[PDB]
Ligand binder design. Sequence first.
Ligand SMILES: [Cl-]
Length: 124
Amino acid sequence: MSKKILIVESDTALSATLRSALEGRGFTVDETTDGKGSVEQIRRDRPDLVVLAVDLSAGQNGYLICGKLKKDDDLKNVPIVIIGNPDGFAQHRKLKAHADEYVAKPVDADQLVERAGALIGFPE
Ligand SMILES: [Cl-]
């Protein structure tokens, strides 16, 4: 009865750290550095939770990707945790297309594991 997480994050060092911690708890975890294809990957692979960074590579932006996901009638139900500079969190919460949760960088991997479990439950 696997719980699946996708990390959209071009900081591969951080993504690996987060992945190991989540996998340690029993989550299945995939990673992508590509924000451009992220929405369609989410539609294909159907993760139970998305961890989405703000500052992504090749001009991609987590708030904009979150916008597309939360305006999509099919995908707006998939929980999104935004990670990044906490400065912009308060503003984005006010938007209709806000994420489900916001975790400030520096992200504590153990803390994120607990926040993931609060959103989608823990592996059993
Ligand atoms: Cl970021």
